[PDB]
Write an enzyme that holds these catalytic residues in place. Structure first.
Site, PDB file in Angstrom:
ATOM      1  N   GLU B 742      -8.909  28.355   0.030  1.00 52.58           N
ATOM      2  CA  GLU B 742      -9.681  27.315  -0.636  1.00 52.58           C
ATOM      3  C   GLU B 742     -10.479  28.010  -1.718  1.00 52.58           C
ATOM      4  O   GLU B 742     -11.237  28.956  -1.450  1.00 52.58           O
ATOM      5  CB  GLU B 742     -10.600  26.584   0.355  1.00 52.58           C
ATOM      6  N   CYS B 776     -18.640  24.242  -3.867  1.00 51.29           N
ATOM      7  CA  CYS B 776     -17.330  24.246  -4.494  1.00 51.29           C
ATOM      8  C   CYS B 776     -16.993  22.876  -5.097  1.00 51.29           C
ATOM      9  O   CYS B 776     -16.252  22.787  -6.081  1.00 51.29           O
ATOM     10  CB  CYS B 776     -16.264  24.700  -3.492  1.00 51.29           C
ATOM     11  SG  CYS B 776     -16.555  26.384  -2.871  1.00 51.29           S
TER      12      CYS B 776
END
Ligand code: FAD
Ligand code: FAD
Lengths: 52, 972, 125, 63
Positions: B742, B776
């Protein structure tokens, strides 16, 4: 793993076929985890509060 | 002479049944009381069902959704402000409904913040899209025109509106007195300039209404309604210190201006999390000696809240302590849906409001009863358009003096006319909505939910399918029994995912007892590894794999669930760590702690479904075929510094749940939280042989991922490091092992002119600057339509200036420090560069130390933003509506695809954007952050990640390998 | 079952959460000579079903069956724009897998070639 | 061209006529009732009869 029969001729949807280690990455062809690997997930989140 | 009451602090969400146990017997009325009520109410409803009505009639007449009603009223207002009526008539007949559906909707809404925006040639055969196009396809263009003209009579008769407050006030002018009190439009100042604007509007309203107050005494003088959220830009419990010092003098100044005209001055009641703070503000304001000798000060109290009766006691004691007469408004409550959703999102231990309508109705009558007994010091104002509620309050008053009813212009007209015919000494106050176009949308939304609601008395009385007797059912007869008080189909927040799993617990910051205890509990609360130690860790994990993989899935799941229990049991310890080692504010730490526990319980539940039993495959007789999923081997888990507990544990418990052993390497900045988590997992049931912690640099991380005996890697972090990991894995001559990575994003948001600017501004501030932009999913790139761009940009900038930057352990802090000096340097370098390259709209003042303040830059084009910048730095691009494709291409061009925000009223636009993009998480009309486990499976594609999504139903399988066992059973 | 409908996620009132699964992009499908029809079609129809377009490279020994299969798929409803057959050596296979615009590779064959493919994928930026 | 008919007659014949007339303006399947119900979208009023039957064996009413 094939017990008390031959080791070949995997049937689609019956013996999902594919190996691990040096034999393969997965997922198994002809099994229920195969298609997902060819796709990507998308989450759609909608604040519906204005509608009721 | 009696004591000033202590700060209000009633329990937030007590049990409904206990309340019903007291309210049900006490609601009893003798047969002749019920008979009078029945007759009065029947007469009021008969009058209601006899003109040209309200919003409800319009919504019912055209079977309009609330969104459709909203669009037509917005279009209606813009058409009413065209200088020449014939121009509007021409537009309605010739343009509206013929085409340009989205253009008309967008322009009329933009008109509300940018008047110049609203002032072509429509090709035939245009596909009917947008709210108006869809309406036209459903009803036909002629009916839409007819519906728009009705909206125009409603907007023209029931609202007092202008571009500025001076225009509204001039328009609502009557040497006559105004037959209306003013319900001022404003709420929720987003900026300091908004707070001054609302203050000045209220002040102007008070002079206008004063100059036309007539010569009678209260209560026969006009009133004005005021919202505390309009007068202060961070009106919230955590900003209480600044609120008490800033808002009180403003509220006092207006109350004085009101007193000077002997007006009724009412502080509206807002969301449940603002109740306590408002009572604090109101008490301090009321205490001022300048308000003696005036009987018009007051506030609204919401009966839909369990705390209402206690608020009444508090208000009475306030009045006695300062020797004042107060005018006190009793309402049911305008924010019900919001309170339900907030309590659920916040994982509260209950709802601050009742969840059955009949319980609100019961509590309203009980509260009215209480208020009536506080006359003459308290002058009760019963705001309701319910004929039964009115008839019932009237009966209990046993007279008609010392109180009034209230209604909103455009509602309850026939009810109160009839009431006045049948009882000539009855008083009622009528309020008109008064304010600017820029405040209309927020008010219209809240108003429309009620006139559209199926449970609403007003909607039902306008539906002739509903017999008069049904409108007269007593609330007590609908509840019948205390245990039936709560709504059977609305779970408590802790049961939101039942029976699949338990929900983590949150804290309501707006309940001072809850927040004080949390702040108190929290306040009361590592050598690197050698490359040899990392290799020994892998080997030791390789040894523990055999036994852990063969441990039954239920046993593995039980350990995760016990870990969740221990996390929540020790939340204060973990929150303290998140604050001190992570630099996180209290809300962010608590949210991360919840997410950590949610990961454990979710992977546990998905783990049982997935690994708990084999799947039988169909096949021939005399043969069995079973599919199972087994652990792969040793997983290496590499975690980032920004969610050093939850992402750390998410990745680790997933790998463990699948039956792998794990070597975990946390980010260099955050090993202490990692070590505590690992010790907690061990304590929860993870064997020492199945989980090892190895700390250190990228050199240590690379030692782990280059090891020939590992079976997979789960990684969250930088894109460049993922590729180097992928290359190190691909370089080996052994098995090709899974990489789950990720990585970041350059996350965009698209806002069109149908979006409410105040709301977008809130969501942009949150998404870009919360956690100092160190998420993020954080907003990096805002695209905004040019017609609303100036207003949107100014509002985001004004809102960002209100963010407190500083020590994360201080409750008032909104933005904590960035993680380290190297992070601050990279951010400051990007800032210096952007200053020479792009328009600067905002550059906030940072405190001394490792801090970067929110910055806002406008780019000429999206291509100027080439890197993910992991800090509180928003980039804005304004665009033309017809150039949405250029915007979409610009987003596609980066190669990233993590989160995307979309803000629009227009379902066709939203759907067109969703269809086009390939982003992992799309958030429509809300913020872009705080993905909830098992609700928003979180993860990106392209440069943003590999999949599968963490916290979703495809994650666990990736950590496992399939095995088919085929047995020839024919011998049996 | 998988792509026919979205999965509704539990969540708070006043919010909807739906999980869908979308095609990734262009898949390169590389197939062996030993099951030149079935493994060829297995890999290809899987990628297509998931909503990807496909460039298929069959083994050098067995292109005639691959071309007949691809032609049959076209006739069955797979648009010409969604499925292409490219025949040739390992060098052509390497051209396909080194291409920066592809979204994935499905491969059946030798261990050594899989690693070379995996390294070529990992080498890209 | 269209011809418009007016009901014409005596009071003693009205009741029998009113009954027959009212069954139609009240019927849920009636086009007139549906077109006056704005809950019913224009496209629904335009469904072709053949698309509602689909198959011969579905011609009779199942209930
Ligand atoms: C002049 C005026 C000023 C007002 N000021 C305020 C204010 O400052 N703050 C504020 O919050 N409200 C305020 N209101 C109230 C709000 O605007 C609504 O008008 C009011 O709640 C409607 O109540 P009712 O007796 O008219 O209608 P009804 O149709 O009798 O009652 C509807 C109410 O029931 C409640 N309700 C609906 N469903 C449920 C359920 N499932 N469980 C529990 N309760 C439910 C809600 O409160 C809802 O509004 C004001 C109203 C007026 C007329
Ligand atoms: C000037 C005039 C004269 C007329 N004269 C006569 C007459 O002499 N004799 C006579 O019988 N009618 C006569 N009618 C027809 C009758 O009065 C109705 O007006 C007519 O049937 C309505 O059809 P439609 O196309 O208007 O409406 P629609 O709403 O399209 O059609 C309704 C019709 O469908 C039919 N129907 C309803 N449900 C079902 C079902 N489940 N299965 C099968 N069929 C169903 C019925 O015939 C019903 O009237 C006359 C109508 C007019 C305007």
């Amino acid at each position: 793993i094939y017990v008390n029969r031959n080791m070949i001729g995997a049937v689609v949807g019956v013996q999902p076929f594919g190996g691990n280690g040096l034999s393969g990455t997965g997922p198994k062809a002809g099994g229920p985890h195969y298609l997902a690997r060819f796709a990507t997930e998308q989450t759609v989140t909608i604040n519906t509060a204005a509608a009721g | 002479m009696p004591n000033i009451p202590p700060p209000f602090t009633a329990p937030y969400a007590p049990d409904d049944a206990e309340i019903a146990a007291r309210l049900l017997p006490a609601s009893h009325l003798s047969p002749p009381q019920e008979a009078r009520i029945h007759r009065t109410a029947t007469r009021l409803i008969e009058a209601i069902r006899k003109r040209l009505g309200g919003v409800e009639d319009m919504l019912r007449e055209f079977a309009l959704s609330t969104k459709e009603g909203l669009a037509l009223m917005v279009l209606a207002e813009a058409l009413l402000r065209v200088p020449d009526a014939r121009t509007a008539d021409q537009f309605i007949e010739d343009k509206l409904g013929e085409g340009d559906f989205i253009h008309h909707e967008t322009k009329s809404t933009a008109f509300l913040v940018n008047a110049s925006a609203w002032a072509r040639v429509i090709q035939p055969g245009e596909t009917p899209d947008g709210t108006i196009g869809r309406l036209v396809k459903r009803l036909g263009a002629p009916a839409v025109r007819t519906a728009t003209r009705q909206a125009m009579r409603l907007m023209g008769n029931h609202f007092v509106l202008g571009e500025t407050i001076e225009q509204a006030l001039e328009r609502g002018k009557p040497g006559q007195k105004t037959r209306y009190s003013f319900d001022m439009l404003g709420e929720g100042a987003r900026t300091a300039a908004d707070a001054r604007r609302y203050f000045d509007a209220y002040a102007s309203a008070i002079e206008t209404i004063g100059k036309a107050a007539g010569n009678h005494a209260l209560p026969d003088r006009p009133g004005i309604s005021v919202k505390l959220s309009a007068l202060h830009p961070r009106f919230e419990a955590i900003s209480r210190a600044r609120v008490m010092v800033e808002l009180v003098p403003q509220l006092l100044d207006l109350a004085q201006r009101a007193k000077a005209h002997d007006l009724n001055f009412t502080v509206d009641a807002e969301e449940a999390d603002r109740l306590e703070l408002s009572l604090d503000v109101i008490a301090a304001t009321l205490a001022d000696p300048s308000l003696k000798g005036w009987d018009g000060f007051g506030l609204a109290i919401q009966a839909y809240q369990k705390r209402a009766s206690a608020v009444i006691d508090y208000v009475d004691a306030l009045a006695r302590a300062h020797d004042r007469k107060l005018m006190v408004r009793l309402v049911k409550g305008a924010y019900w849906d919001t309170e339900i959703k907030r309590a659920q999102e916040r994982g509260l231990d209950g709802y601050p409001v009742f969840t059955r309508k009949a319980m609100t109705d019961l509590n309203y009558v009980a509260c009215a009863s209480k208020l009536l007994a506080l006359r003459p010091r308290i002058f009760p104002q019963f705001a309701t358009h319910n004929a039964l509620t009115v008839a019932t309050v009237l009966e209990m008053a046993e007279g008609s003096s010392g109180f009034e009813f209230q209604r909103l212009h455009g509602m309850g007209e026939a009810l109160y006319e009839q009431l006045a015919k049948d009882h000539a000494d009855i008083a009622y106050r009528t309020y008109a909505p008064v304010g600017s176009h820029r405040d209309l949308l927020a008010y219209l939304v809240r108003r429309l939910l009620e006139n559209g609601a199926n449970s609403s008395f007003v909607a039902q009385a306008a539906d002739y399918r509903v017999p008069v007797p049904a409108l007269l059912q007593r609330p007590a007869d609908a509840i019948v029994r205390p245990q039936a008080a709560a709504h059977p189909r609305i779970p408590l927040p802790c049961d939101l995912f039942a029976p699949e799993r338990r929900n983590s617990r949150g804290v309501e910051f707006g309940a001072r007892t809850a927040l004080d205890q949390l702040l108190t509990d929290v306040k009361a609360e590592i050598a690197d590894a050698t490359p040899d130690q990392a290799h020994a860790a892998v080997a030791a994990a390789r040894a523990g794999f055999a036994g852990w993989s063969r441990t039954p899935a239920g046993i593995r799941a039980a350990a995760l669930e016990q870990a969740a229990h221990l996390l929540e049991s020790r939340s204060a310890h973990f929150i303290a760590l998140l604050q001190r080692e992570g630099g996180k504010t209290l809300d962010d730490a608590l949210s991360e702690l919840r997410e950590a526990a949610d990961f454990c319980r979710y992977y546990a539940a998905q783990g049982r479904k997935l690994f708990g039993s084999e799947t039988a495959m169909p096949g021939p007789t005399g043969e069995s075929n079973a599919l199972t999923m087994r652990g792969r081997g040793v997983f290496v888990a590499i975690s980032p510094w920004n969610f050093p507990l939850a992402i750390f544990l998410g990745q680790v418990t997933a790998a463990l749940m699948a039956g792998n052993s794990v070597v975990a390497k946390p980010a260099e900045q955050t090993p202490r939280i990692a070590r505590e988590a690992v010790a907690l997992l061990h304590e929860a049931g993870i064997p020492k042989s199945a989980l090892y912690l190895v700390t250190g640099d990228g050199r240590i991380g690379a030692a782990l991922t280059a090891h020939p005996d590992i079976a997979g890697v789960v990684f969250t972090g930088s894109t460049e490091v993922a590729r180097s990991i992928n290359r190190a894995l691909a370089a080996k001559d052994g098995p090709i092992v899974p990489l789950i990575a990720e990585t970041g994003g350059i996350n965009a948001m698209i806002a069109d002119a149908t979006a409410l600017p105040e709301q977008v501004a809130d969501w942009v501030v949150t998404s870009a600057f919360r956690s100092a932009g160190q998420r993020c999913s954080a907003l990096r790139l805002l695209f905004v339509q040019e017609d609303v761009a100036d207003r949107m940009i100014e509002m985001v900038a004004g809102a960002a200036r209100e963010l407190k930057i500083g020590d994360p352990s201080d409750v008032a802090t909104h933005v904590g420090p960035v993680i380290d000096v190297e992070a601050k340097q990279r951010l400051d370098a990007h800032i210096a560069r952007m200053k020479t390259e792009a328009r600067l709209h905002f550059a906030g003042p940072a405190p001394e130390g490792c801090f970067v303040a929110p910055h806002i830059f406008e780019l000429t084009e999206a291509g100027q933003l080439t890197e993910e910048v992991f800090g509180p730095i928003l980039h804005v691009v304004r665009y033309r509506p017809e150039n949405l494709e250029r915007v979409l291409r610009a987003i596609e061009r980066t190669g990233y695809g993590l989160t995307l925000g979309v803000h629009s009223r227009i379902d066709d636009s939203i759907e067109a954007i969703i269809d086009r993009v390939q982003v992992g998480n799309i958030y429509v009309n809300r913020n872009m952050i705080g993905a909830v486990v098992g609700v928003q499976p979180f993860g990106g594609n392209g440069l943003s990640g590999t999949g599968p999504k963490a916290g979703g139903p495809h994650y666990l399988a990736r950590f496992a390998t399939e095995q088919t066992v085929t047995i020839n059973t024919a011998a049996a």
